Amino acid sequence: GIIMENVTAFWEEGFGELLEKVSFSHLCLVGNPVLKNINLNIEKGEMLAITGSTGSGKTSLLMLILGELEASEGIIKHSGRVSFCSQFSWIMPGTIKENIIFGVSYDEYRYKSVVKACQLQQDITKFAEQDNTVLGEGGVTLSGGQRARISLARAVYKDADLYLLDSPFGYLDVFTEEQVFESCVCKLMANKTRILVTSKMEHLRKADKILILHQGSSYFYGTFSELQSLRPDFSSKLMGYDTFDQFTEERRSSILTETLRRFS
Numbered sequence: 001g002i003i004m005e006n007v008t009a010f011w012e013e014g015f016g017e018l019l020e021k022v023s024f025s026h027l028c029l030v031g032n033p034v035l036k037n038i039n040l041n042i043e044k045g046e047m048l049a050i051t052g053s054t055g056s057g058k059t060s061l062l063m064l065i066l067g068e069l070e071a072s073e074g075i076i077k078h079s080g081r082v083s084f085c086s087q088f089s090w091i092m093p094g095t096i097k098e099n100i101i102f103g104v105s106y107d108e109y110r111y112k113s114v115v116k117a118c119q120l121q122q123d124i125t126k127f128a129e130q131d132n133t134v135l136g137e138g139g140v141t142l143s144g145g146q147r148a149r150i151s152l153a154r155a156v157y158k159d160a161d162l163y164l165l166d167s168p169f170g171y172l173d174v175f176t177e178e179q180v181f182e183s184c185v186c187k188l189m190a191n192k193t194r195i196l197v198t199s200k201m202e203h204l205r206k207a208d209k210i211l212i213l214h215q216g217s218s219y220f221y222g223t224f225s226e227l228q229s230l231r232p233d234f235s236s237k238l239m240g241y242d243t244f245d246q247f248t249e250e251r252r253s254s255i256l257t258e259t260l261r262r263f264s
């Protein structure tokens with residue numbers, strides 16, 4: 001499981017460099033918080049959806065769990081192997097397969113089931129060599145979604161206790177992404193403790209807990225139901241869109257941000 005009791009963390013010199021790699025020294029000198037009074041309790045097998053305004057601390061909270069940012073006040077409790085899957089989808093030179101099982105024991109069943117749920121079948125079938133196509137470093141002629149699904153597969157194949165998925169559903173092939181959410185994150189991963197950063201409303205619905213950050217602070221925590229009751233101005237605005245989850249990542253963040261400001 002993963003517990004966070006009143007946690008706060010400050011700009012440490014060097015942290016913002018890592019945040020580029022995944023002005024800073026002014027935030028460091030001045031001593032601001034990057035997250036502030038963060039609280040959450042996720043029990044084994046639960047799925048936490050994290051969302052919020054753009055630049056609100058979401059990736060920084062993942063760096064906290066990974067142990068890259070140092071929590072000044074608070075307790076952070078969790079244990080085991082943790083599998084991280086960043087926004088930036090990196091690709092090592094080698095085959096699509098090699099990339100997915102990087103430095104980890106092959107397991108024909110486990111592999112086929114990840115490859116499958118992550119919607120990579122539609123993809124590797126396009127290629128003369130299937131999942132034995134060799135990729136150049138950075139996976140460059142691929143699409144943004146293709147890289148993202150390769151990077152997700154790689155991360156989900158890893159066997160671990162906690163899975164941190166940072167924003168893999170933000171590209172244009174929006175239906176595949178709906179498939180992937182459902183087969184991978186919701187079915188195949190259903191028994192694994194997993195945190196998902198996201199700007200799609202659907203993911204909030206189907207989650208166990210929810211965390212919405214804004215200007216570094218927790219603007220909400222607790223379940224999807226509580227969200228509608230407790231922050232209703234929020235809930236009205238967002239839920240009352242036609243197909244908000246098929247807006248671009250860019251437009252979804254814009255509204256989340258404009259909305260979080262209105263009702264602070």
Ligand SMILES: Nc1ncnc2c1ncn2[C@@H]1O[C@H](COP(=O)(O)OP(=O)(O)OP(=O)(O)O)[C@@H](O)[C@H]1O
Nearest residue numbers: 016019020034053054055056057058059060061253
């Ligand atoms: N590449 C960057 N250049 C300058 N400042 C940055 C950069 N990445 C993050 N920050 C700063 O660190 C804090 C934000 O980051 P985090 O990286 O925690 O945001 P998120 O909540 O993950 O948002 P985003 O949609 O940008 O990923 C912000 O207040 C922002 O000012």
Ligand SMILES: [Mg+2]
Nearest residue numbers: 058059087167
């Ligand atoms: Mg982020």
